[PDB]
Design an enzyme around this catalytic site. Sequence first.
Site, PDB file in Angstrom:
ATOM      1  N   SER A  58       0.784  -1.237   0.000  1.00  0.00           N
ATOM      2  CA  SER A  58       0.000   0.000   0.000  1.00  0.00           C
ATOM      3  C   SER A  58       0.810   1.278   0.000  1.00  0.00           C
ATOM      4  O   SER A  58       0.198   2.345  -0.144  1.00  0.00           O
ATOM      5  CB  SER A  58      -0.891   0.083   1.234  1.00  0.00           C
ATOM      6  OG  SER A  58      -1.616   1.279   1.276  1.00  0.00           O
ATOM      7  N   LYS A  61      -0.134   3.442  -2.854  1.00  0.00           N
ATOM      8  CA  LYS A  61      -1.270   4.364  -2.866  1.00  0.00           C
ATOM      9  C   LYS A  61      -0.809   5.806  -2.974  1.00  0.00           C
ATOM     10  O   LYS A  61      -1.413   6.594  -3.705  1.00  0.00           O
ATOM     11  CB  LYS A  61      -2.146   4.178  -1.619  1.00  0.00           C
ATOM     12  CG  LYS A  61      -2.936   2.884  -1.600  1.00  0.00           C
ATOM     13  CD  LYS A  61      -3.657   2.696  -0.263  1.00  0.00           C
ATOM     14  CE  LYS A  61      -4.808   1.716  -0.387  1.00  0.00           C
ATOM     15  NZ  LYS A  61      -4.326   0.320  -0.525  1.00  0.00           N
ATOM     16  N   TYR A 171     -10.968   2.207   4.743  1.00  0.00           N
ATOM     17  CA  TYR A 171      -9.882   1.725   3.890  1.00  0.00           C
ATOM     18  C   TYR A 171     -10.393   0.769   2.818  1.00  0.00           C
ATOM     19  O   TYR A 171     -11.177  -0.138   3.105  1.00  0.00           O
ATOM     20  CB  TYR A 171      -8.842   1.014   4.753  1.00  0.00           C
ATOM     21  CG  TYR A 171      -7.464   0.953   4.144  1.00  0.00           C
ATOM     22  CD1 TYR A 171      -6.979   2.006   3.394  1.00  0.00           C
ATOM     23  CD2 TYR A 171      -6.636  -0.133   4.362  1.00  0.00           C
ATOM     24  CE1 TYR A 171      -5.714   1.974   2.855  1.00  0.00           C
ATOM     25  CE2 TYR A 171      -5.371  -0.188   3.825  1.00  0.00           C
ATOM     26  CZ  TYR A 171      -4.914   0.869   3.067  1.00  0.00           C
ATOM     27  OH  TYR A 171      -3.653   0.837   2.535  1.00  0.00           O
TER      28      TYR A 171
HETATM   29  C1  SIM Z   1      -2.935  -5.023   0.292  1.00  0.00           C
HETATM   30  C2  SIM Z   1      -3.198  -3.828   1.210  1.00  0.00           C
HETATM   31  C3  SIM Z   1      -1.957  -2.937   1.424  1.00  0.00           C
HETATM   32  C4  SIM Z   1      -2.042  -1.488   0.866  1.00  0.00           C
HETATM   33  C5  SIM Z   1      -0.850  -3.792   0.913  1.00  0.00           C
HETATM   34  C6  SIM Z   1      -1.564  -2.690   2.815  1.00  0.00           C
HETATM   35  O1  SIM Z   1      -0.485  -3.170   3.071  1.00  0.00           O
HETATM   36  O2  SIM Z   1      -2.364  -1.848   3.755  1.00  0.00           O
HETATM   37  C7  SIM Z   1      -1.743  -1.721   5.012  1.00  0.00           C
HETATM   38  C8  SIM Z   1      -1.144  -0.355   5.253  1.00  0.00           C
HETATM   39  C9  SIM Z   1      -1.284   0.151   6.679  1.00  0.00           C
HETATM   40  C10 SIM Z   1      -0.891   1.601   6.763  1.00  0.00           C
HETATM   41  C11 SIM Z   1      -2.692   0.023   7.138  1.00  0.00           C
HETATM   42  C12 SIM Z   1      -3.326  -1.089   6.860  1.00  0.00           C
HETATM   43  C13 SIM Z   1      -4.727  -1.260   7.204  1.00  0.00           C
HETATM   44  C14 SIM Z   1      -5.246  -2.433   7.367  1.00  0.00           C
HETATM   45  C15 SIM Z   1      -4.451  -3.641   7.023  1.00  0.00           C
HETATM   46  C16 SIM Z   1      -3.731  -4.155   8.258  1.00  0.00           C
HETATM   47  C17 SIM Z   1      -3.518  -3.343   5.869  1.00  0.00           C
HETATM   48  C18 SIM Z   1      -2.703  -4.550   5.530  1.00  0.00           C
HETATM   49  C19 SIM Z   1      -3.579  -5.635   4.943  1.00  0.00           C
HETATM   50  C20 SIM Z   1      -2.708  -6.778   4.486  1.00  0.00           C
HETATM   51  O3  SIM Z   1      -1.852  -7.187   5.517  1.00  0.00           O
HETATM   52  C21 SIM Z   1      -3.578  -7.942   4.171  1.00  0.00           C
HETATM   53  C22 SIM Z   1      -4.161  -7.797   2.794  1.00  0.00           C
HETATM   54  O4  SIM Z   1      -3.246  -8.336   1.875  1.00  0.00           O
HETATM   55  C23 SIM Z   1      -5.409  -8.631   2.726  1.00  0.00           C
HETATM   56  C24 SIM Z   1      -5.215  -9.549   1.572  1.00  0.00           C
HETATM   57  O5  SIM Z   1      -4.203 -10.405   1.596  1.00  0.00           O
HETATM   58  O6  SIM Z   1      -5.968  -9.506   0.625  1.00  0.00           O
HETATM   59  C25 SIM Z   1      -2.588  -2.198   6.194  1.00  0.00           C
END
Ligand code: SIM
Length: 400
Positions: A58, A61, A171
């Site tokens: 992410s 983004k 999100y």
């Molecule tokens: C694929 C999503 C992306 C942008 C890679 C991501 O890194 O956002 C991150 C950035 C961070 C600031 C805040 C976040 C908010 C909520 C989540 C824990 C997210 C990580 C999700 C990732 O750990 C799991 C996804 O991959 C689900 C899937 O596997 O489809 C996480």
Amino acid sequence: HMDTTFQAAIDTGKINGAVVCATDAQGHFVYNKATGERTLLSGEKQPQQLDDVLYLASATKLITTIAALQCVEDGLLSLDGDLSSIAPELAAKYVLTGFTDDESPLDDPPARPITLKMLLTHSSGTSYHFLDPSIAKWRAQYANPENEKPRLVEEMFTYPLSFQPGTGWMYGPGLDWAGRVVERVTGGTLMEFMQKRIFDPLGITDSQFYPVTREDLRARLVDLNPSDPGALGSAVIGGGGEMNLRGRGAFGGHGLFLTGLDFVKILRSLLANDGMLLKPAAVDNMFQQHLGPEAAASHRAALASPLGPFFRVGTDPETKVGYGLGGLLTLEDVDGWYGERTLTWGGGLTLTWFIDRKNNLCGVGAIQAVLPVDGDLMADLKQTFRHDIYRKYSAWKGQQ
Ligand SMILES: CCC(C)(C)C(=O)O[C@H]1C[C@@H](C)C=C2C=C[C@H](C)[C@H](CC[C@@H](O)C[C@@H](O)CC(=O)O)[C@H]21
């Protein structure tokens, strides 16, 4: 305390290394450090290097956010314009309000059009099903695509909105939609546009969306290794990576690969506001609260929810925050740490970045973890970076 903290994590076998790049606007204070080792597909080990190619997840983004704002500068888009024509798939989405007791879905037509600003600030209503329980419930009843067929952005994100456009925060795939909007209004791929408008002006040539096909890049992928022969980025996102394997075309939400050194060039151009990517007033507008009253209240509920630690990106629950164009936006000073209007976000569980204009500092810190990823340890490691880099910055200022 990055040094001893990261080394402890290497010793326990929970990470292999880390890449950290930080700088002020002029490159007076610069801190670049690669720590640990990478593993090649052959099993042979090599020291972590600053030009290793990282999975941004992410952190993509922010870059997609810049690309969309560049189309705004070109007159191809506006922040508040109706996107229903360019992206009819968004206009056709209804707003899921909840379920009856016999568990049937209540929806309503959208009250207003979805705009670019809503996509960039996660206030359009498009929500990640794995974060939005109401959308998770709908996905499962109106299931199932074990199609496995590679899907474009618009074939992947087919769920209803979670709330009326502009009136909430969650999100989700807004930047995958914005990326597709950039492709449609330019008539080219997202990679083509970014290469020409973002990477070329900064001298960046070592970047690619998933899947990484270039041989020179594959030879430097941290995430091409015996644990991840697909170079899917599993270590960064913590299991999978499912979305990458199932996608087709560029995903502006999570798809880019980039070196830490090249990522910080983008951060610094925004920090210095040097016109390489956007006009200064357009950059200034990124560092403003762009959630309206209802959306801001929704944002704060999510920040107080059990997912809130992820959404807070290490900021304290007492710190008032909004959402800018590009990430979380602090709205008050924390003395000795982020100044007010610091923009920050990250990727997966292992990578985080910030741009602190008031205190003149930006940086990315990207842990290279070992599957299975210890999530609580990542939070701690990222926090160590976010605070130790300010400690290092103060020590340097003091030595002048
Ligand atoms: C694929 C999503 C992306 C942008 C890679 C991501 O890194 O956002 C991150 C950035 C961070 C600031 C805040 C976040 C908010 C909520 C989540 C824990 C997210 C990580 C999700 C990732 O750990 C799991 C996804 O991959 C689900 C899937 O596997 O489809 C996480």
